[PDB]
Design a protein around this ligand. Structure first.
Ligand code: FAD
Length: 498
């Protein structure tokens, strides 16, 4: 069971790694716990929509759940389901629920495709040891090209009924002296125009996104992973979850892997050894594997930084009630295109995404998912009893995030004479959802738990390439930063180490 290189996971950091390793001629094996999403379901489609969720929508749950913010309208379509290897996983900790994708392509399968580059001045603040010039001149441009990032046609956007909810919020924000910015995406906008014209099968215009897109979205299986497979040096094994990592007596690495079926049944436990080990299991997946290894003594040389510095990228979701004369439209595109930029690097910094409402009818609701600058951080601690890493994060740690978001939208409300919706997130009457996370960052911070290139401190030929490297915050949607950073690290690693 020997393979020169093994990449754990198939997300952004893992995808970049596999391609570059394949191109360099290194035989690589990717292990992914989720499924390869290429089989059509009971309805003929691969993925289920948000209006017709089934077992494909969730990772081993006994009932579907309405997307955050749409409970009042989408709870009606929920049904009981058999636990299955679905695409979206809600991982619940004490006071924090983290949503992560499961399958070949990782989070790219379930995300809104927003590809944004962080402000340079902020990037320099969060990672002072990294050369920002190399990132902005070479790696970010390289990431955007390979991801197939594209821009929306501003004329179509301005006249289509599908983005009226976006234009409405732009008018409101404008009144409060705030500005909006167009956000690039990996969803083919040209394809989106043809959807509106009824020329091609709808996906983004058919209330699809969080459980995957049947068309239009260029997820990693279509970009990095397709190219990696094309090298003839990369293979991908699905439904294979890595449990433990240890170092052989001669310096190599050995892994214990559980092969399961789609129903969760354990089919076999395998031992796979390698020379170069790349971790791309995400902020949660990589961190857990490392804290388990350290605290169970299989990798006793990991430092105390492993598991620290976790942040939810300041994620806060709020909602505003529009006046009757400001309808947002019954037909709303599932892919965001506009954002409110109020990020200046201060404590009141806010970058808000104008999120769509999948209801299908007029709600007069304007939904936002704010990204704030909150210094609070959590820590992953290993629980030897249950054999799981537990996140030590308390709801009160999100107060700064809530305050910053509230400061912004309080301005918009005052200028437009509007109020917040308090009944969208639960019966608790909360205008701000502060216990969820779509963008987990940290746990194995760059330069802390690793060197400046993701080499895990204390070991040789052991690398971390994903979201766990980011120090809890970036100020914008994270996947481009994760991809560009992986480009920077793997290139250096292949040159010096491999
Ligand atoms: C609803 C939603 C909306 C979002 N929208 C956006 C957006 O618009 N723009 C943006 O920039 N970002 C967005 N994100 C966040 C983005 O998806 C994540 O930041 C990104 O996917 C993180 O990349 P990663 O490489 O670190 O790990 P991930 O993409 O999470 O991938 C890790 C992979 O490793 C696998 N893995 C885990 N542990 C194991 C194990 N032990 N063995 C085997 N395999 C394992 C996982 O199953 C998974 O496939 C959103 C995410 C969600 C949930």
């Amino acid at each position: 069971g020997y393979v020169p290189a093994v990449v754990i996971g198939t997300g952004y950091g893992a995808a970049v790694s596999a391609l570059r390793l394949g191109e360099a001629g290194v035989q690589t094996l990717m292990l992914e716990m989720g499924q390869l999403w290429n089989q059509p379901g009971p309805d003929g489609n691969i993925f289920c929509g948000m209006l017709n969720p089934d077992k494909r929508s969730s990772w081993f749950k006994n009932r579907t759940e309405a997307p955050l913010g749409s409970f009042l309208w989408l709870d009606v379509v929920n049904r009981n389901i058999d636990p299955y290897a679905g695409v979206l996983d809600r991982v619940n900790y004490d006071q924090m629920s983290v949503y992560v994708g499961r399958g070949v392509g990782g989070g790219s399968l379930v995300n809104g495709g927003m590809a944004v580059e962080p402000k340079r001045s902020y990037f320099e603040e969060i990672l002072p040891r990294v050369d920002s010039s190399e990132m902005y001149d070479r790696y970010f441009p390289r990431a955007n090209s390979m991801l197939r990032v594209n821009h929306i046609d501003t004329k179509w956007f301005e006249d289509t009924e599908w983005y009226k909810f976006a234009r409405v919020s732009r008018e409101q924000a404008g009144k409060a002296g705030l500005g909006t910015v167009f956000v690039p995406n990996v969803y083919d906008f040209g394809y989106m125009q043809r959807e509106a014209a009824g020329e091609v099968p709808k996906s983004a215009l058919a209330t699809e996104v969080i459980y995957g897109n049947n068309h239009g979205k260029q997820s990693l299986d279509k970009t990095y992973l397709a190219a990696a497979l094309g090298t003839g040096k990369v293979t991908i094994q699905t439904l294979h979850q890595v449990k433990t990592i240890r170092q052989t007596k001669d310096g190599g690495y050995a892994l214990t892997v559980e092969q399961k079926d789609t129903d969760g049944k354990l089919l076999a436990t395998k031992e796979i050894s390698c020379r170069y080990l790349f971790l791309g299991a995400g902020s949660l997946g990589s961190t857990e594997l490392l804290v388990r290894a350290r605290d169970t003594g299989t990798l006793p040389n990991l430092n105390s930084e492993v598991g620290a510095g976790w942040g939810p990228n300041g994620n806060i979701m709020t909602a505003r009630a529009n006046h009757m004369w400001n309808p947002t439209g019954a037909h709303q595109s599932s892919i965001p295109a506009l954002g409110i930029d109020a990020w200046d690097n201060s404590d009141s910094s806010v970058f808000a995404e104008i999120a769509p409402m999948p209801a299908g009818l007029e709600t007069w609701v304007s939904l936002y998912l704010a990204i704030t600058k909150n210094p609070q951080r959590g820590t992953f601690v290993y629980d030897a009893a249950t054999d799981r890493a537990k996140l030590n994060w308390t709801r009160d740690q999100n107060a700064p995030a809530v305050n910053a978001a509230k400061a912004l939208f309080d301005r918009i409300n005052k200028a437009n004479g509007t109020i917040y919706r308090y009944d969208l997130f639960g019966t608790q009457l909360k205008a701000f959802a502060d216990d969820f996370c779509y963008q987990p960052l940290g746990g194995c911070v760059l330069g802390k738990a690793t060197d400046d290139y993701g080499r895990v401190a204390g070991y040789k030929n052991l690398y971390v390439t994903d979201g766990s490297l980011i120090p809890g915050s970036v100020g914008v949607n994270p996947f481009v930063t994760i991809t560009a950073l992986a480009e920077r690290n793997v290139e250096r690693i292949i040159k010096q180490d491999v």
